[PDB]
Design a protein around this ligand. Structure first.
Ligand SMILES: O=C(CCSc1nc2ccccc2c(=O)[nH]1)N[C@H]1CC[C@H](c2nnc(-c3ccccc3)o2)CC1
Ligand SMILES: [Zn+2]
Length: 211
């Protein structure tokens, strides 16, 4: 099964991960309603998810994809946030838990910006916030997000992704690109759980802006 390996802060691997997270905090047009109001995170833990079988599934799919993508599996490190993280780190991603509805198709979404994924830690639009205080901007409760290896293969670009069940023929992923009457940032979508490996499990808190 899965083994979570704690990384130490002096480890350069820890420092890269936290830097990518801290440096990708972006401005969201919702006044912080979904993910809360914060300028930085308090990263309190970064664990490496080690799962032999899960890795083998990932690499096997990566091979299939590469052969259909002129030998480029096109892997990318991206963020993912959702209430399913504990289940994911133990069994791997599962597209069976992805449904068409609202602004999303039946795929698993990833973001280049940590702050975007933070908006989904407690559910779509931040849900009702943390379980304990029902505060989307809770500075107390610990949140978790994943920094994963994502096999994109041949990506199909489009503006809306809310009605997708699978990637278009010949493709392995879909990228929702920004538009004036639509998305603010790009969203990476896969429709097969095995196209993502939850490399790092980040435990953190958003920090209140300093006075
Ligand atoms: O990606 C999304 C959209 C909203 S969440 C979201 N939306 C975004 C949109 C744009 C940019 C970033 C994000 C983001 O980070 N999260 N839903 C996903 C969330 C995780 C689900 C799932 N995957 N594996 C499982 C599983 C469950 C039980 C046992 C084992 C595995 O569940 C599938 C649907
Ligand atoms: Zn709370």
């Amino acid at each position: 099964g899965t083994i979570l390996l704690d990384l130490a802060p002096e480890d350069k691997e820890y420092q890269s991960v936290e830097e990518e997270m801290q440096s990708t905090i972006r401005e969201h047009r919702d006044g912080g309603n979904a993910g809360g109001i914060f300028n930085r995170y308090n990263v309190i833990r970064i664990q490496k998810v080690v799962n032999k079988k899960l890795r083998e599934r990932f690499c096997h799919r990566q091979k299939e994809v590469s052969e259909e993508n002129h030998n480029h599996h096109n892997e990318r490190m991206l963020f993912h946030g959702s209430p399913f993280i504990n289940a994911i780190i133990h069994k791997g991603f599962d597209e069976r838990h992805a449904y068409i509805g609202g602004m999303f198709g039946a795929g698993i979404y990833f973001a280049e910006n940590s702050s975007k994924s933070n908006q989904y830690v407690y559910g779509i639009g931040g849900g009702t916030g943390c379980p304990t205080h029902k505060d989307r901007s809770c500075y107390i409760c610990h949140r978790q997000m994943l920094f994963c290896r994502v096999t994109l293969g041949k990506s199909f670009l489009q503006f809306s992704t809310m009605k997708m069940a699978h990637a278009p023929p010949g493709h392995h992923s879909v990228i929702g690109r920004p538009s004036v009457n639509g998305l603010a940032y790009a969203e990476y979508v896969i429709y097969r759980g095995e196209q993502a490996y939850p490399e790092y499990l980040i435990t953190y808190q958003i920090m209140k802006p300093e006075h």
